[PDB]
Write a protein that binds this ligand. Structure first.
Ligand code: FAD
Ligand code: FAD
Ligand code: FAD
Lengths: 590, 590, 590
């Protein structure tokens, strides 16, 4: 032993924590650190992006997709501030990530020098750790603790690092990594008393429903078995569709806007809700559970117990173990009018969606684009979804199973999350098929980074929806506003831009050309090319399932007529009809 | 059912969470809320203090002493800002507490009105929850969540509440409490693989030492049994003395300044350290573990694993269970030179302390005041200790056991924590003997609140050390400075002030009068009186155990001579002598 | 030249800026700096307080009273946080002040060491400068800039200083003071076009009124001359009474609660308002100007123009110059019914106040305490007023002139501002009579610092109002609440406490004893003693002039009867009567 460069010590620490990829853009305030990358057999790699926000989002999405702890860097000042959308997303999603903010050298601090400023206030509100390194020798210790904190506190750990520190040398015995001491709690078994109370309520309920969030990830088969055992339909969240087999007989979808018709009707007619591993944000403001009688909640976070609705039964512990315990103790239900009515309601919805997806000719709609994806995607495909209307509606069409991964920016909802997500995913799974589904608005905030996929040979399939408008925003102008719309722009040739970036571009605007174009796009991706499919679609909006104008006791004939005509929903049948057909009555309608 | 006042709903929620005591000062920006207190059979009580900081600290100390969740209020502006020292203490100690900041009515917000301001920035840095209520109807929900968060996140939950909101009425079905869903994780068993690794290291160590922090609270007997089984001396932290029987043969005390001579010598000679449930803050900066060979850590917080020193073995889980598992698996050690040497070193230290405590006549020193306390205190006495030098040194004298509770402001170290601590303690244990041990400086920041104990008939014994100087500060002027001192003030008659406040005052300055005065003070307290014992002591400083000038191989004869003379330590023997007497050699000296 | 200690360099810089007094409490994290005080012929002195908040408030009040730039220090952690109320007051009042936050040495930063923490977030929201010194050598530069910024930006400049920096030595040519370059703008003349527009409106107004704030400080004689010239009554603000001769024929007082009856009636009947140098905070929320027709504003701050009400005429520049220009150009008014009616209304109010102040026997009321002060105070007496109801009402009784200074915490309104104010005032004017007028609640938050006046031989007269209740708070429980009150405490002997602190205490509870007690108190103060007059007054509340129940067209006979009986206001006459007597009619009543 002898001496070691502080920058190298930092890289050794990062590698010990599994943080082998740093995302960002090189700069003078970060050079000393980056210069240590590699050599001494270090395995930390640098992935250079075009905009630091994409680097931050990529580092975060890497973890969302099950990858290693990500690290993102931003040069002192503007580079650091550019990380904001990625860090806010991580903070709200409780995703570990280490953000390193470069800074002018120590001697320049507080001198009002060029691009010199106090960056401590920048992320203090959202960070789980936020410190300005005070002297070179403690940099290794703080990077180690930043990783430890990001992981333990499930959030953003931020370090402001003066650019001269990494150049300093220290004794090899003056630093260490605590990665070897990394420990995590194994799934914890729920209290028998709480499981028992839940079992009693479920046994005595006439209309049970399972509302499963990502806390049930990895336990879809068990949840489906419980659903079948007690004849309780399943409602999922916008983040948890992959947990279920897309064609599961009792899957009603999700509630509210980015949801399905069945789920939205089921929740208003349910009696007992098993809220498993969810923190559904629309709960209170949209009155999701306004008609429920009993509410059972399962969660590993005590801060969540009884948060979204009063909980008659609270179960603290792992959702897997809890579901298994409930499954073993609850009584089996052979026949149920409630179950039968729900199955028919779901089937009716699937008929509608299938009809839209399988059209043969005409102006392209996003429905058929999703159909093409289903017909050509690998069974274990990864989906990086952006936040627009046409992209979030993907959960109504993608035929996913737990073999897939579907991730977005679900709560903070930052636009432009797709491309960075694709980078994080492909970096983690180089041999796996990765799709980025993006709307024109979101694409326009991040398409310069398509070149990043090209440069690093991380081939992804970019599916871009171009409608010259904004469906999502076109939905918030007919529910609170009164004046005319106004969200129509020009016609940018994204395929041409892709070609200019070294990617392969395709343009499609007809349903009859979609299958061929998708096949060619997939084949090109398999040849190692990043592709951009510019889908010139119509201005059609996904049917608003939060405002179902189908029940003749809730809306007028004219309203139902116009609703059916606009969304091609002539064959959709209101849930009450299915309930009454099985001898039941609506608990709230009339 | 029908309607309910929002303020009353808030009180019902607080009571459901066990928060039956609100500390603060009445004001117009808090009146609507306080007006709901009581009535409708509500049991929430208000304890009015003289300075809001005492209310905040009292609410926090209430929890430190094992009481219910505390609530502290501060009027918009100055009342709210006055809570700062109490909230910072809670934040750093990870103590749950709900702080309600009053505010001018909604209509005045952002108008630059009188005593109107944005208070959201005030505590955002330290809070686990920090929100400004946006409308009256959600106040109940936010107070409920504030309690849930404070407890779940072990910290400060802050709510800024416009003064007009509590006056509003809502439907009784428009609010609920999630207190019924409160759940906490039971002690979690450690991984067998980690316990086994620890057992191997302890079995093969020639000089094992147990360093126990408050994570071992409630398991002192087991820790003492392990110490005896493997012949490993025990070192404790400044916060964890009550966990051990004060006279335990192998208790070496704590390290650094507020510690004992034995512990400070033991840690520099130890080979293997079992760091159980501690986050000792002096670890790195004072090089506490600079000579240790192996380090084993037990903690329930993964963020702490390997934080204070590289951990060769990391055990995640409850300290109780871990200690029990280690105790059952480790080999018993019959004889140990290391153990024998430590026992003699401890005995030598106890001879010194006993000699100081048992003096019969002369100018009063804090040593004899502590002696008097030991001779008259109840076996289950509660001690609220302030942060000065003469008060923290109490851990060298108080003969405590797990039947006692000793609490202070250990990390943030805010002065004036004693009186508030006494309030929180007496509020929780009305029939228990409570002592506030305070230095003149700290007392001077909080003595107006002695009247609070008087007014609410919460009798406590205030022991005040008056030396016209500041021992603690008189220690940081001979280790980094060079110029003369200068910390001598006047002679305020605290006994007279106490009498003026309705309390009983005593003044003592001679060792031969101490026992009688203490007896009278205790008897007065048992008659329901709050007492203030103004102890006029000498300027003697507690022997500096962080700089032991006793070993002739570490310091010169003249230094050792002067050291022994100044601290009356002629009979103290350096640990190396005891080591060599048992056939061992110092691992670092020479 | 050669070398110099950084701490000494800092003191030389402070002295060059006139900052010769540092307020605070000594501590290890501040010792290196304080050790440099004095020697090398430096004139910076240290004034040690009992609670750091008093040190902060004293440093701030020093400037409010026309003294030099104040400096306040707070030890790392709790000492620093204790400064908050003083700093918020300075921030809201736009008063320059330098706050130095001590900190653990550089090597301990970010190590989670004892009493070690990031203090940058603490005051970032309110500071005009807030930096953590990055290395020793730049400390002098930053202290110099802190002073420059505090003064130039009229606010709080904060520096966090690691305790090891001041010990470092630098070359004497490596530091400098920019105090020699201190420059301030002289009064700026207003635009002739704006003065002319104002002159036209005033000339054509039938009911002009001058509303003067502290922007008119130093120009009272001119304002009174303008009032007489155009026959426009004068309304002042709670901060600006000293600007006028207390007995000025046309002084109506101030509006709202801490005001007089005349002003409150005048503003609702006025047509044109000359709003000179004011930022009256109650303007919008209390509808102060709801009946005004024209509004003219004069201010040196463009941010204030049109802030409190739409401005028909805006004058940017010095109030003195503007008043002089208006005075020279406006037409003289010989007779005015509006003026005559106002003079009678004012006289009627003065009859009432005089009657209360001159009672001869009975239970003491604050009215007679103020009478005694008027009869014994020096013509140039300085008044440090706290924020309670009985103390703010002093503007209804004190017979002040520009020779006096009256200061409080007017906007942030922190309780306990009086004692610190007295310290700042006496430090600045050692040979001047200084009075601290305090309510029992405020006194209880700061009385331990009475000893500070004693210790430093800065004799002040503390007048304490003890009513066992809280008048102010007793006013916000009968305008928004509904339930019973509840603000009665014990009876603390403040005179006895004062004696215990080395001060001279007096107790008085009868009107017939007030003059003698005051005479003795003043004589004692002239003998160099700090005094505390414990005035045991009744629970009588100052008449609520914001809710004048006197006009038979605004309130019922029973209401007027009860109002007159409760406040001994049988002889008060509603302004409308005086208006009609002069041939005028109310513009809003009926
Ligand atoms: C534009 C846009 C529109 C959207 N529209 C909708 C919509 O209409 N409908 C919809 O549903 N969503 C929608 N979303 C997504 C939505 O905002 C939420 O992010 C999502 O519903 C949250 O899902 P969740 O409850 O599964 O998980 P989270 O909110 O992440 O909460 C998961 C919960 O599971 C708990 N948990 C974790 N692990 C375990 C375990 N092992 N055992 C037990 N509990 C565990 C956690 O503590 C947590 O409480 C939309 C998002 C965007 C960006
Ligand atoms: C003026 C002053 C001087 C001081 N001087 C000294 C001094 O000289 N020496 C000294 O030792 N102290 C001193 N202190 C106190 C010192 O600052 C620390 O607060 C104290 O040592 C921390 O003790 P701790 O490690 O027991 O607990 P904490 O710092 O509170 O840490 C406890 C640890 O236990 C873990 N834990 C909690 N529950 C469990 C469980 N069930 N199982 C396992 N782990 C668990 C926690 O996660 C945490 O990591 C002083 C304080 C003041 C104010
Ligand atoms: C408990 C309590 C109760 C109170 N009750 C009342 C009450 O009932 N009534 C009341 O009136 N006050 C009351 N106050 C005081 C009140 O809150 C305000 O602080 C005060 O009225 C502000 O007075 P101001 O407008 O003179 O000065 P400021 O608010 O300080 O504004 C002065 C203005 O003058 C300008 N200025 C400065 N220098 C010049 C110059 N040379 N030329 C031109 N313009 C200049 C400034 O830019 C500024 O806009 C109370 C305070 C407390 C603590």
């Amino acid at each position: 032993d002898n001496k070691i460069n502080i920058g190298l010590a930092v890289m050794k620490i990062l590698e010990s924590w599994g943080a082998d990829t740093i995302y960002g853009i090189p700069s003078g305030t970060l050079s000393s650190l980056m210069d240590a990358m590699g050599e001494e057999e270090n395995n930390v790699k640098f992935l250079q992006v075009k905009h630091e926000e994409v680097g931050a989002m990529a580092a975060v999405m890497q973890s969302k997709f099950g990858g290693n702890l990500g690290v993102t860097v931003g040069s002192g000042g503007p580079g650091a501030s550019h990380l904001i959308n990625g860090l806010y997303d991580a903070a709200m999603d409780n995703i570990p990530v280490v953000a390193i903010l470069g800074s002018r050298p120590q001697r320049e601090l507080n001198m009002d020098a060029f691009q010199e400023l106090n960056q401590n206030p920048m992320y203090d509100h959202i960070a789980v750790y936020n410190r300005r390194v005070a002297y070179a020798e403690q940099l290794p210790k703080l990077v180690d603790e930043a990783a430890r904190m990001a992981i333990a506190k499930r959030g953003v750990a931020v370090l402001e690092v003066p650019g001269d520190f990494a150049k300093v040398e220290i004794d090899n015995d003056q630093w260490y990594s605590s990665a070897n001491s990394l420990r995590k709690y194994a799934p914890i078994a729920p209290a028998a008393q709480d499981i028992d109370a839940a079992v009693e309520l479920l046994n005595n309920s006439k209309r049970p429903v399972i509302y499963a969030g990502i806390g049930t990830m990895g336990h879809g088969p068990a949840v489906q078995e419980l659903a079948r055992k007690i004849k309780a339909p399943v409602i999922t969240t916008g983040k948890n569709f992959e947990t279920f087999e897309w064609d599961f007989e009792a899957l009603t979808g999700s509630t509210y806007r980015v949801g399905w018709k069945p789920a939205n009707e089921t929740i208003l007619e349910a009696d007992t809700v098993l809220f498993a591993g969810s923190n559904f944000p629309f709960s209170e403001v949209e009155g999701t559970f306004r008609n429920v009688d009993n509410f059972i909640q399962i969660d590993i976070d005590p801060a969540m117990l009884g948060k979204r609705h009063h909980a008659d039964v609270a179960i603290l512990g792992d959702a897997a173990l809890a579901i298994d315990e409930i499954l073993n103790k609850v009584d089996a239900v052979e026949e149920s009018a409630w179950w039968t009515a729900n199955l028919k309601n779901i089937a009716n919805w699937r008929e509608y969606i299938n009809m839209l997806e399988t059209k043969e000719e005409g102006d392209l709609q996003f429905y058929q684009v999703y159909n093409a994806i289903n017909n050509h995607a690998d069974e274990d495909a990864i989906y990086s979804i952006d936040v627009g209307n046409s992209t979030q509606t993907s959960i109504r069409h993608l035929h996913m199973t737990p073999k897939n991964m579907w991730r977005t920016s679900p709560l903070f909802a930052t636009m432009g999350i797709a491309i960075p997500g694709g980078l994080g995913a492909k970096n983690t799974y180089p041999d796996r098929q990765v799709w980025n589904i993006i709307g024109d608005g979101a694409f326009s905030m991040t398409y310069p980074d398509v070149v990043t996929n090209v440069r690093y040979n991380m081939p992804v399939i970019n599916v871009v929806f171009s409608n010259t408008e904004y469906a999502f925003i076109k939905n918030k102008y007919e529910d609170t506003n009164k004046n005319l719309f106004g969200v129509d722009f020009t016609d940018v040739d994204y395929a041409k831009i892709a070609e200019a970036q070294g990617a392969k571009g395709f343009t499609v605007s007809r349903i009859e050309d979609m299958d061929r174009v998708m096949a060619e796009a997939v084949a090109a991706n398999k040849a190692g090319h990043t592709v951009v499919i510019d889908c010139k679609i119509t201005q059609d909006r996904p049917i608003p399932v939060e405002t179902l104008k189908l029940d003749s006791k809730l809306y007028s004939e004219d309203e139902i007529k116009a609703y059916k005509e606009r969304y091609e929903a002539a064959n959709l049948v209101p849930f009450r009809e299915y309930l009454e057909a099985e001898g039941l009555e609506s608990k709230y309608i009339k």
